[PDB]
Design an enzyme around this catalytic site. Structure first.
Site, mmCIF file in Angstrom:
data_model
loop_
_atom_site.group_PDB
_atom_site.id
_atom_site.type_symbol
_atom_site.label_atom_id
_atom_site.label_comp_id
_atom_site.label_asym_id
_atom_site.label_seq_id
_atom_site.Cartn_x
_atom_site.Cartn_y
_atom_site.Cartn_z
ATOM 1 N N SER A 1 33.947 30.707 38.075
ATOM 2 C CA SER A 1 34.751 30.120 39.128
ATOM 3 C C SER A 1 34.158 28.784 39.543
ATOM 4 O O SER A 1 32.952 28.602 39.512
ATOM 5 C CB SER A 1 34.832 31.071 40.330
ATOM 6 O OG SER A 1 35.487 30.457 41.410
ATOM 7 N N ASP B 1 40.654 49.695 33.342
ATOM 8 C CA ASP B 1 39.385 49.148 33.789
ATOM 9 C C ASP B 1 38.930 48.035 32.862
ATOM 10 O O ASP B 1 38.392 48.315 31.783
ATOM 11 C CB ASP B 1 38.332 50.272 33.840
ATOM 12 C CG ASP B 1 36.961 49.785 34.281
ATOM 13 O OD1 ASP B 1 36.870 48.652 34.766
ATOM 14 O OD2 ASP B 1 35.984 50.564 34.164
#
EC number: 3.4.23.22
Length: 330
Positions: A199, A35
């Site tokens: 992004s 994770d």
């Protein structure tokens, strides 16, 4: 040193991925959820409330000759999905795909929340975010990667998650045969303890690319792709019959639909998520309404590049002095 381990979807929807981990002496192999959005290595154990264990493999520290109770240490965590767990702490030997850390903090669960009990395939979590998020008290503990870092050939690990198929976590090296083209690296902020990056934008299907900054985290422990409501609305508008359902808790779409791809930007590079990756199947058994793999982050407070996005790429988690993230197509 290096390590390499295969990671396997827990079910037919790729809801999560499990990776075998050797704990203790002799080895006790548990299947953990790696994770990159959390920083505790915790396991089902011989100490877990019996009624809260249902099919998981447990760590029994009393059977490990290298286990040592970390005196006074406790841990407790709550995840973004509403789930939680808590307990005490041992140090023990932990190996992943041939890479061994001695003295790793292994957080033994005394209590787990129902969602963990109900998932027989996940024996615990192995956190790969930054150690600043580790919940052990009163002395914070380091992640497996943090402990291994100095010994690794290169201070990196890579995530190569499969779509309906096994994939790979590598530690200490970049497998240049595992991706196509080049790896585009992008800046990371560690201020919130996550692999947080920006992004450069998105496209829906064959649509034009929208240049826009989207801050979010690369999180292998989250199933879906959580993005701003504007972006998500633009995606599902291209799927006839799709709608946001308050009762179901997100966007749903007719199971007969063909889903468009979703592209996200990494600098000037582009990662294409095929439409099929965005289908998470009937909302309930037998239903012809299907749950979408792209959902709104509104009310999460952060955008999350979860498995839906990450499995479309070869992802480098670069733990150099100044961390960065790399993405390649594959």
């Amino acid at each position: 040193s290096t390590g390499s381990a295969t990671t396997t979807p827990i079910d037919s929807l790729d809801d999560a991925y499990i990776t075998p981990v050797q704990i203790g002496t002799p080895a006790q192999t548990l299947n953990l959820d790696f994770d990159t959005g959390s920083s505790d290595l915790w396991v089902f154990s011989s100490e877990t409330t019996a009624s809260e264990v249902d099919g998981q493999t447990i760590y029994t520290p009393s059977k490990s000759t290298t286990a040592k109770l970390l005196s006074g240490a406790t841990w407790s965590i709550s995840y973004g999905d509403g789930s939680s767990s808590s307990g005490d702490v041992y140090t023990d030997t932990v190996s992943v795909g041939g890479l061994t850390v001695t003295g790793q903090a292994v957080e033994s669960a005394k209590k787990v929340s129902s969602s963990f009990t109900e998932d027989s395939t996940i024996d615990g979590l192995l956190g790969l975010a930054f150690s600043t998020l580790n919940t052990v008290s009163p002395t914070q503990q380091k992640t497996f990667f943090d402990n291994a870092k100095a010994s690794l050939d290169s201070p990196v690990f890579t995530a190569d998650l499969g779509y309906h198929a096994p994939g790979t976590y590598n530690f200490g090296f970049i497998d240049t045969t595992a991706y196509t083209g080049s790896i585009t690296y992008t800046a990371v902020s560690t201020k919130q303890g996550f692999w947080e990056w920006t992004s450069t934008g998105y496209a829906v299907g064959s649509g034009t690319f929208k240049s826009t900054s989207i801050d979010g985290i690369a999180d292998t422990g989250t199933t879906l792709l959580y993005l701003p409501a504007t972006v998500v609305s633009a995606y599902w508008a291209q799927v006839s019959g799709a709608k946001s359902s308050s009762s179901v808790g997100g966007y749903v779409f007719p199971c007969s639909a063909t889903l468009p791809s979703f592209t996200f930007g990494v600098g000037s590079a582009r990662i294409v998520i095929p439409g099929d990756y965005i289908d998470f199947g009937p909302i309930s058994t037998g239903s012809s309404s299907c749950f979408g793999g792209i959902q709104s982050s509104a009310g999460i407070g952060i955008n999350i590049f979860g498995d839906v996005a990450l499995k479309a790429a070869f992802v480098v988690f670069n733990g150099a002095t100044t961390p960065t993230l790399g993405f390649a197509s594959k």
